[PDB]
Design a protein around this ligand. Structure first.
Ligand SMILES: CC(=O)N[C@@H]1[C@@H](O)[C@H](O[C@@H]2O[C@H](CO)[C@@H](O)[C@H](O)[C@H]2NC(C)=O)[C@@H](CO)O[C@H]1O
Ligand SMILES: CC(=O)N[C@@H]1[C@@H](O)[C@H](O)[C@@H](CO)O[C@H]1O
Ligand SMILES: CC(=O)N[C@@H]1[C@@H](O)[C@H](O)[C@@H](CO)O[C@H]1O
Ligand SMILES: CC(=O)N[C@@H]1[C@@H](O)[C@H](O)[C@@H](CO)O[C@H]1O
Ligand SMILES: [Cl-]
Ligand SMILES: [Cl-]
Length: 528
């Protein structure tokens, strides 16, 4: 028998996608790899080197070669952990080394352990499984809001939408970003040396670099929101995770995509992004909005954008089908859309739904502190009791989509987990505050004019509360400060559940998950 082989000490943690934990540019951040090369070297003690050498992974042969070299190199394609041994043979028989643990990491989380949700606040088990129940998780919530992925009530969600994946571009291309201090500068860093119109990550620190629960080791392959999402998917195998591209301030590049050159760069970038970040199950298109009236007033062209949107969806669906065939997986394609009828009219949704599995109707932000004059329900199902002629309602938006021929199955109704409101509202009559005028935005939790649902509850005693059962909408008022806030409550949300059930819609989705204390998400999952 040959001498006993002993494997040399080595870093044996490998990554099919390498992360530079100091990089700020997306192109330095990741190093995607075809394969990983597992390296082993050994020495032989008390006997001969053997006539032949084998490498075993969990007692399966993965290499044979020269015993005299005392070295082997083994190609590995997929993530996982396994025991590696060296086995030396001669005519007599074999001697085997002690095993070493080898770890190959990849973005499907194959090297990870499940990250389970511990039940926080008022959240309660029970998920409505015959409907779409989705929520947006915002990338930047890991800061002030202190809401990392591990606080997300994933057992009660069918879908988690990651907001937001940006499109690369500087001056002229992401000007909307300039309305938020540092936001445009931050994106420029992330896209440094990266071609315009490619997808990237806005905050690679929050996305992958920041230590978080269960991904905080010194040599952790993937940290941040992304690392947490890989692990959380293992704990919640029902869940689908979608990268959401665009949103209010990141939508500008879409307006340039009538040009097939830029559109091609974008679609290819998306394809590469999903191959790099295996934990995503598709793509959510959140263009705000075809036709304009988004964060950037200069932008928008109705006839041109309606076609761009259709073309873009078609090409994304065709790309996603290639991925499906190539990986054996099922990839979704969705879009978040305005619930304003004047924005809905821009787009042929009967044509769009030929590429889309779901449409996230953004039935909120109907009204807000951008105007002191136009006071009303920021979200609501029907027209208010005091104004039966309101068109900015969930019912009208849904009706408009139905009239266009959209399957009601594909329509997902939006729930705001925050309120929009005004301060100092006066010059009104008969305690109808909505006939008054505001003196500015209500003081806000994180931004002014907007209040987390959780903050609203904590502050309930400061307010007189009103439900409008005709409209299925709620609000609060504090004469003391003249504070008026319209928001989704347990009542109005149950209203929306009833509305969705009655009209056979696809389900509901919330914006944004960190603002809830569990009340609203429980309500969303209520089954009648
Ligand atoms: C009906 C409507 O949306 N009116 C416009 C407002 O929406 C818009 O404010 C923005 O609404 C977005 C929701 O779709 C928010 O995410 C966005 O944050 C909010 N505004 C700001 C500054 O944050 C305003 C522009 O403020 O214009 C209205 O006409
Ligand atoms: C960065 C890193 O992973 N370092 C190594 C790891 O590879 C090795 O497997 C382990 C002992 O096996 O000791 C660690 O220090
Ligand atoms: C990315 C992840 O965590 N899990 C996916 C899973 O969604 C999919 O069903 C499966 C099919 O191959 O591929 C896994 O990688
Ligand atoms: C931002 C805004 O207030 N837009 C108004 C909306 O309030 C109104 O209900 C509807 C009337 O058609 O559309 C717009 O004129
Ligand atoms: Cl860098
Ligand atoms: Cl390697």
């Amino acid at each position: 028998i040959p001498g006993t082989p002993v494997i040399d000490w080595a870093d044996r943690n490998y990554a099919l996608v390498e992360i530079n934990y100091e990089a700020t540019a997306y192109e330095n951040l990741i190093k995607p790899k075809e394969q990983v090369d597992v390296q082993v070297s050994w020495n032989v003690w008390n006997g001969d080197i053997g006539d032949i050498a084998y490498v075993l992974f969990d007692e399966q042969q993965v290499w044979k070669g020269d015993a005299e070299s005392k070295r082997a190199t083994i190609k590995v394609l997929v993530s996982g952990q396994f025991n590696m041994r060296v086995k030396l043979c001669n005519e007599d028989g074999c001697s085997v080394s002690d095993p070493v643990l080898v770890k190959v990491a990849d973005t499907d989380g194959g090297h990870l352990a499940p990250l389970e949700y511990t039940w926080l606040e008022n959240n309660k088990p029970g998920r409505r499984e015959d409907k779409i129940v989705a929520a947006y998780f915002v990338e930047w919530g890991v800061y002030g809001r202190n809401f990392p992925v591990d606080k997300v009530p994933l057992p009660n969600l069918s879908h988690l939408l990651y907001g937001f994946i940006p499109i690369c571009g500087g001056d002229g291309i992401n000007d909307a970003l300039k309305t938020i201090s540092g936001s445009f500068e931050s994106l420029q860093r992330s896209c440094k040396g990266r071609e315009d119109f490619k997808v990237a990550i806005h905050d690679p620190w929050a996305a992958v670099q920041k230590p978080q629960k269960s991904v905080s080791a010194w040599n952790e392959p993937y940290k941040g929101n992304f690392g947490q999402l890989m692990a959380a998917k293992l704990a919640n195998p029902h869940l689908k995770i979608l990268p959401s591209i665009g949103g209010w301030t990141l939508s500008d590049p879409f307006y340039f995509m009538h040009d097939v050159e830029k559109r091609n760069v974008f679609v290819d970038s998306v394809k590469e992004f999903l191959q790099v970040w295996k934990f995503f199950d598709g793509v959510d298109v959140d263009w705000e909005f075809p036709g304009g009236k988004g964060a950037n007033p200069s932008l928008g062209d109705a006839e041109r954008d309606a076609k761009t949107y259709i073309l873009l969806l078609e090409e994304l669906r065709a790309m996603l089908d290639d991925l499906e065939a190539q990986t054996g997986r099922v990839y979704e394609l969705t879009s978040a859309i305005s619930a304003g009828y004047d924005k809905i009219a821009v787009v042929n949704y009967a044509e769009a739904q030929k590429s889309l599995g779901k449409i996230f109707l953004m039935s909120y932000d109907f009204k807000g502190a951008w105007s002191n004059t136009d006071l009303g329900y920021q979200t609501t199902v029907y027209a208010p009791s005091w104004n039966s002629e309101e068109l900015y309602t969930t019912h009208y938006a849904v009706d408009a989509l139905l009239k266009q021929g959209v399957d009601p199955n594909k329509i997902i109704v939006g729930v705001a987990m925050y309120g929009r409101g005004w301060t100092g509202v006066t010059n009104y009559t008969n305690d109808n505050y909505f006939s008054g005028t505001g003196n500015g935005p209500v003081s806000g939790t994180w931004e002014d004019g907007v209040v987390d649902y959780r903050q609203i509850q904590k502050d309930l005693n400061n307010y007189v509360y009103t439900f409008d059962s005709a409209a299925q909408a709620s609000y609060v008022f504090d004469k003391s400060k003249g504070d008026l806030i319209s928001f989704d409550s347990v009542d109005s949300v149950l209203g929306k559940v009833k509305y969705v059930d009655r009209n056979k819609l696809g389900g509901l989705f919330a914006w944004e998950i960190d603002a809830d204390n569990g009340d609203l998400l429980n309500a969303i999952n209520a089954q009648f």
